């Protein structure tokens with residue numbers, strides 16, 4: 001009935017139009033060490049975050065899942081500022097991006113238990129002293145592999161999901177390990193109706209998707225607008241793939257997002273001009289002003305789109 | 319003539335008795351993500367740090383190099399608190415512990431330049447807004463290898479040393495890559511009189527040490543008290559090895575320390591009883607109350623010990 005947001009418990013029936021995967025802040029692990037040239041501008045960042053939020057609100061978005069990992073600059077108090085300003089629901093995550101802190105604890109023998117303990121504290125007690133609980137557990141695997149280290153988190157996550165009924169959301173690397181992630185989680189008693197396999201758009205083969213869908217998990221095409229980088233496919237290939245699945249009747253299992261980074265942590269940078277032009281549509285409005293349109297031209301009805309944007313998040317969190 | 323400390327420039331001739339490698343705070347990268355169960359207790363930590371400092375002061379220690387990497391909880395303002403309290407000189411570092419933040423910048427093409435730029439800013443301008451400059455560049459290599467990623471830092475470091483005359487201090491993993499580190503740095507124009515190859519005590523073969531010494535670099539036996547873990551040797555093996563070198567007349571090239579972690583960042587823990595007893599002498603007084611004694615029984619004169627503790631740091635920083 002309720003999900004934890006950065007503003008406390010919210011009835012699931014009120015989440016409405018939802019983006020399943022967007023980052024207000026994000027930094028790659030290691031950004032912390034580059035503090036001197038990469039200082040966090042809090043009032044400017046807040047401004048950008050608020051803008052991004054209003055943009056979503058313009059297209060009816062009432063709720064956003066921000067799955068920024070604990071080691072990637074997750075900042076629940078800052079996200080609470082955004083929500084307090086805009087009235088946007090924001091659900092944050094507990095999890096790590098895809099050693100040696102946990103490598104050390106593996107030596108101690110307590111690593112998997114420590115991770116489970118972290119997930120439980122952050123799901124049921126609160127993150128640091130923010131009084132904010134995460135609503136999702138965030139997981140990530142490597143290219144072509146779910147490593148022993150990663151499986152620790154997958155096992156801790158499954159155990160925490162049993163206890164809390166929390167949602168698991170995952171990162172797949174370069175369109176691999178979708179079926180493996182779903183199978184491994186189910187092995188350990190996770191509930192498929194509470195799992196989103198992420199970055200599934202990274203793979204263009206519909207068989208791979210169906211293989212994953214057969215587990216009864218949600219899949220996310222959540223990188224709309226990312227092109228020419230991280231071995232990613234084109235938006236055209238995304239739509240093609242998404243079209244095969246929808247025509248095949250899979251709409252109760254699919255959600256869409258952009259995986260935007262609205263504020264980058266660490267040292268500012270500028271993408272080179274080959275990369276730069278390709279990434280031009282990577283922003284929180286893209287789904288609504290480009291993708292959803294082309295989908296309609298391909299005959300996707302509104303009941304379906306609503307299933308993805310409203311029905312599916314509502315099923316997922318309830 | 320001067321070195322930058324956490325309290326500003328200090329004449330090198332006043333550094334006096336010096337420990338070349340000790341950590342007031344340290345956390346393994348990733349500790350940041352474990353904030354909920356691993357919150358930093360600032361006033362308690364300060365208390366412990368101050369105690370540790372006074373302990374060093376009891377044995378005449380006037381100066382300490384704290385080479386905690388940027389991504390391991392380096393906190394210059396906190397170290398400045400310690401120095402202001404105790405009058406201890408503390409020299410801090412710029413560097414990273416032994417991706418994907420810098421992996422990403424490698425993609426951008428700016429990684430090595432960004433690292434050099436960081437070293438220059440932190441050596442000559444200041445760390446974040448603390449107004450503290452690092453006095454050393456800290457480097458680290460992997461077991462049996464200096465990876466392409468690591469060489470980036472080694473190259474950036476050599477370039478920064480040319481410009482600034484700063485000291486380089488290194489981490490070797492499990493007694494490997496000593497000669498390789500010295501050779502690679504010298505290749506790129508680094509000054510051997512400004513280089514300390516660290517953790518050299520990790521290797522028990524005196525030939526390996528002599529091989530490294532032949533470059534004219536300093537070597538550090540800086541893990542006195544660490545036993546039974548990290549593939550480490552015994553203190554007895556350390557002393558044996560150190561004895562061969564001193565008898566061979568190498569005292570102008572050797573320094574000693576414990577590589578202590580006085581406050582651990584991240585989640586508290588307790589070492590298991592096998593490990594625990596092994597590690598019992600791992601504290602900042604060990605050199606002075608156990609090692610230096612046994613050295614005298616083996617006939618090490620005080621002129622020599624002074625060369626290591628006073629003359630060598632004085633040569634190194636001048």
Ligand SMILES: [Fe+3]
Pocket residue numbers: 021023067259
């Ligand atoms: Fe993401």
Ligand SMILES: [Fe+3]
Pocket residue numbers: 339341385577
């Ligand atoms: Fe160290």
Ligand SMILES: [O-]
Pocket residue numbers: 171259
């Ligand atoms: O991501």
Ligand SMILES: [O-]
Pocket residue numbers: 489577
């Ligand atoms: O270390």
Ligand SMILES: [Zn+2]
Pocket residue numbers: 170171172198199
């Ligand atoms: Zn991801």
Ligand SMILES: [Zn+2]
Pocket residue numbers: 488489490516517
């Ligand atoms: Zn080290």
